[PDB]
Amino acid sequence: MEMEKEFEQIDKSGSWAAIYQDIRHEASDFPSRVAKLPKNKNRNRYRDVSPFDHSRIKLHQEDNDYINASLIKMEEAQRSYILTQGPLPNTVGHFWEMVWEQKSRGVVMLNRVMEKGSLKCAQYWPQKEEKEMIFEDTNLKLTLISEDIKSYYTVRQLELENLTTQETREILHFHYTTWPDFGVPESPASFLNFLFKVRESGSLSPEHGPVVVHCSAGIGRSGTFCLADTCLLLMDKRKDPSSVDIKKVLLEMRKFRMGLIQTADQLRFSYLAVIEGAKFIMGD
Numbered sequence: 001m002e003m004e005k006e007f008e009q010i011d012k013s014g015s016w017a018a019i020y021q022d023i024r025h026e027a028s029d030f031p032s033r034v035a036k037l038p039k040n041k042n043r044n045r046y047r048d049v050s051p052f053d054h055s056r057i058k059l060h061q062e063d064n065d066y067i068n069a070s071l072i073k074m075e076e077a078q079r080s081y082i083l084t085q086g087p088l089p090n091t092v093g094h095f096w097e098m099v100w101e102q103k104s105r106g107v108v109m110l111n112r113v114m115e116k117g118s119l120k121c122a123q124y125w126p127q128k129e130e131k132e133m134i135f136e137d138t139n140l141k142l143t144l145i146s147e148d149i150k151s152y153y154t155v156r157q158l159e160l161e162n163l164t165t166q167e168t169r170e171i172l173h174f175h176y177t178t179w180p181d182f183g184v185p186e187s188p189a190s191f192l193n194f195l196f197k198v199r200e201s202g203s204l205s206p207e208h209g210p211v212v213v214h215c216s217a218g219i220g221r222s223g224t225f226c227l228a229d230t231c232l233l234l235m236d237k238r239k240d241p242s243s244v245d246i247k248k249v250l251l252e253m254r255k256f257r258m259g260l261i262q263t264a265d266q267l268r269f270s271y272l273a274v275i276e277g278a279k280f281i282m283g284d
């Protein structure tokens with residue numbers, strides 16, 4: 001079926017939970033043996049969210065190459081994404097090592113450091129220009145260059161230096177700051193505006209390594225971001241945009257990381273975002 005009318009048909013019939021459970025039943029199951037090794041327990045935020053072995057990002061280190069991060073490679077859309085958990089106190093250095101080694105331009109953050117009165121990820125970037133951060137375990141230096149605070153999101157320019165080679169690179173930090181503590185946003189308008197700002201920066205384009213996207217677990221809000229982006233790109237590429245099947249795209253993405261889209265409300269919100277986003281692209 002088309003999307004917008006499949007949408008109204010699920011609303012009128014109140015069957016979002018049944019649709020979402022079908023997706024969960026059909027989703028791929030692949031091994032994640034490296035994630036479950038005992039030496040990696042303090043590298044995982046949640047015991048039930050792990051990268052598959054076949055698609056995990058490897059750190060360029062011979063001691064321990066493990067990070068909770070997956071490469072989502074979308075062949076028809078010609079986009080790649082790295083989805084990862086929010087960094088932990090003992091993985092902030094690994095996180096920036098990955099950004100460096102994978103040649104990423106942008107980092108997309110969809111959570112606040114504290115939500116619901118608890119810490120959802122480490123304070124992993126500097127908050128003042130004159131107070132830079134040094135990660136001694138991976139030999140990297142990170143400096144805040146500039147910060148632009150808007151009503152729904154903040155964009156930061158950061159300098160990452162490989163202290164071993166003295167090479168430097170500019171990294172863009174795109175921080176969506178207004179996702180509600182419970183539920184999903186009422187309108188997708190500010191999320192779409194944010195997605196378009198990431199796009200306009202070059203961070204999603206083939207001349208750079210894959211964008212790094214995270215929330216707390218790296219599957220829920222993060223899944224919504226890449227699902228909406230890929231679906232809108234396919235609607236632009238194809239002769240028949242109504243042929244884009246969001247459930248099929250989501251199942252393809254779940255071949256590369258488990259659990260993408262965590263609730264039926266997140267599924268409905270993803271439909272809403274793609275539907276509204278397709279009108280703004282045109283032709284309008």
Ligand SMILES: CNC(=S)NC1CCCCC1
Pocket residue numbers: 076234243244245246248249250252
């Ligand atoms: C309408 N069908 C679609 S969009 N099928 C898939 C979606 C994910 C990747 C390949 C095409």
